[PDB]
Amino acid sequence: NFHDQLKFAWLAGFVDADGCINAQIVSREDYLLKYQVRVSLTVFQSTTQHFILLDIQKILGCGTVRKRNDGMSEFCVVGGTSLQTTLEKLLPYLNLKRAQAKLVLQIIKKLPNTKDPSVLMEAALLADKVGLLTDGKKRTILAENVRECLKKLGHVVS
Amino acid sequence: NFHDQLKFAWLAGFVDADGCINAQIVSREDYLLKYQVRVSLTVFQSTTQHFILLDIQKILGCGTVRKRNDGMSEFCVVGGTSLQTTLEKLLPYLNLKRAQAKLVLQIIKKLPNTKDPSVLMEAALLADKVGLLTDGKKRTILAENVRECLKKLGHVV
DNA sequence: TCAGAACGTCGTACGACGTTCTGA
DNA sequence: TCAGAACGTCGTACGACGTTCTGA
Ligand SMILES: [Ca+2]
Ligand SMILES: [Ca+2]
Structure with a gap:
């Protein structure tokens, strides 16, 4: 792991630059609560170097690689189980994105208990908090969307 | 020391992603041979995180930081002396860009002998091979232009 | 009902050039 | 004459979203 820590440090550098540690509110039509708080780490690269994404996945031992339809490729670790392990590995070497990772x-x-509306609501507030740290300009689903909906659904939060 | 090389490994990962190890042929009208082969490592970032570039310079212990006029900032290491030292530190850890580093x-x-036009010509030929590895689409000055000019200058390649 | 796998694309933060300033 | 320091900006390779597919 003296070896491994060099890999993780390298990877941390790569994610700090060409990566994206994020948390979204995704609409889920068949969720009782209508929404999920997705969490993800993602690395982007031109498909012409698609292989480096495969090397990251080997390093981490989880996550998926895909080519998108515009000449780009992506590596993605989605969801609490895989992501937590991944982020603890990178956390000591992350510099730019340590805020997003900690958040x-x-x-x-919270995710094991997001069937509870107050918890889902907590997480969504946290999710918006991450979105302020990124360079996003297309974010439309906010915590206030969740709060309006939860209320309309008959639940109680604040 | 292992603390240093965790820094360099991180830096390598950062250069691999948001960096640029490069070689260009720059026009220099007061040069006898009219051209320089410039070598450089550069790290870009939005000025809103200007500070990270200052950390890289602290880690490398050389190079310069600048704010560009479009919200971007850059850390640059130019030229043989400081560059060779820098690249040797990162080389074990570079993955995407190890080819440009070696090139x-x-x-x-060669740079200490580029007053020799035959040597300048070799360097310029190499600088072209680095450019094929980058995603550049704006490259104007090629080795062919150095060769055309040297010959016109009365030299022999 | 969940929720990752896999996806499609908008907007700019990067990359990667070429050029002028400065001074050895 | 050299050659880094400092510069200005074109074109896209990224980021960072939101949506559909699949299956537990
Ligand atoms: Ca970046
Ligand atoms: Ca990149």
């Missing part, structure tokens, strides 16, 4: 780790604490 | 290291061997 996402708080979200992951 | 540029070949160029750096």
Whole structure:
């Protein structure tokens, strides 16, 4: 692992630059609560170097690689189980994205209990908090969307 | 020390992603041979995180930081002396860009003798091979232009 | 009902050039 | 004459979303 820690450090550098540690509110039509707080780590690269994404997945021992239809490729670790393990590996070497990683780790604490509306609501608040740290400009689903909906659904939060 | 090389491994990962190890032929009108082969490592980032570039310079202990006029900032290490040292630190850890690093290291061997047009010509040929590895689409000055010019200048390749 | 796998694309933060300033 | 320091900006390779597919 003296060896491994060099890999993780390298990877941390790569994610700090060409990566994206994020947390979204995704609409889920068949969820009782209508929404999920998705958490993810993602690495982007031109498909012409698709292989490096496969090397990251080997390093982490989880996650998926895909080519998108525009010449780009992506590596993605989605969801509490895989992500938490991944982020603890990178956390000591992350510099730019340590805020998002720590925040996402708080979200992951909550995900087992997001069938409870107040918990789902907590997580979504945290999710918006991550979105302020990123360079996103297309984010439309906010915590206030969740709060309006939860209320309309008959639940009680604040 | 292992703490240093965790820094360099991180830096390598950062350069691999948001960096640029490069070689260009720059026009220099007061040069006898009219051209320089410039070598450089550069790290880009939005000025809103200007500070990270200052950390990289602290880690490398050389190079310069600048704010560009479009919200971007850059950390640059230019030229053989400081560059060779930098690239040797990162080389064990670079993955995407190890080819440019090695190629540029070949160029750096030649730079102390680029008053010799035959040597300038070799360097310029190498600088072209680095450019084929980058995603550049704006490259104008090729080795062919150095050769055309040297010959016009009365030199022999 | 869940929720990852797999996906499609908008907007710019990068990359990667070429050029002028400065001074050895 | 050199050659880094400092520069200005074009074109896209990224980021960072939101949506459909699949199956537990
Ligand atoms: Ca970046
Ligand atoms: Ca990149």
